[PDB]
Amino acid sequence: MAIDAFLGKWCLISSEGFDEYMKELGVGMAMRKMGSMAKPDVYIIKDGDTITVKTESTFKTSQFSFKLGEKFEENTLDGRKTQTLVSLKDDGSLIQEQEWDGKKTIITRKLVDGQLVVECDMNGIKCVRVYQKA
Numbered sequence: 823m824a825i826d827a828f829l830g831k832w833c834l835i836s837s838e839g840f841d842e843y844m845k846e847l848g849v850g851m852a853m854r855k856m857g858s859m860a861k862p863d864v865y866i867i868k869d870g871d872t873i874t875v876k877t878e879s880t881f882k883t884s885q886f887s888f889k890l891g892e893k894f895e896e897n898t899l900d901g902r903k904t905q906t907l908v909s910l911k912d913d914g915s916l917i918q919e920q921e922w923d924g925k926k927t928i929i930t931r932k933l934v935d936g937q938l939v940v941e942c943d944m945n946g947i948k949c950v951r952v953y954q955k956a
């Protein structure tokens with residue numbers, strides 16, 4: 823299905839509003855600096871039905887594996903532990919819903935002109951990051 827379009831290694835080429843989004847998530851200033859400086863690689867890998875989103879950089883490494891439609895606890899880049907659900911819309915964009923501590927954030931990923939466009943919302947605070955195929 824549509825997930826195959828996402829598969830591969832992706833390199834950050836732009837980031838906008840990420841500091842404000844990280845602020846809303848509760849990230850400390852140093853870690854926010856790491857996030858602003860980072861230009862990470864993101865691997866979206868699938869084998870069998872299991873998908874992995876693996877985020878690599880000099881500062882921090884993170885990874886989460888899951889099946890589509892099946893909830894799971896995620897350890898996030900900033901050290902949150904969330905209940906996450908990941909789904910594909912008819913669009914079909916990839917939606918990742920995260921819930922923790924009575925809070926909620928939504929990260930969408932779509933392909934626009936061959937680029938992975940990631941849009942995150944937290945309390946109407948918006949951020950968008952774009953990756954290029956490696």
Ligand SMILES: CCCCCC/C=C\CCCCCCCC(=O)O
Binds near residue numbers: 900
């Ligand atoms: C992304 C570079 C990792 C190094 C910086 C780690 C510190 C803060 C990162 C905030 C993580 C929360 C937002 C991640 C969501 C996303 O990447 O789509």
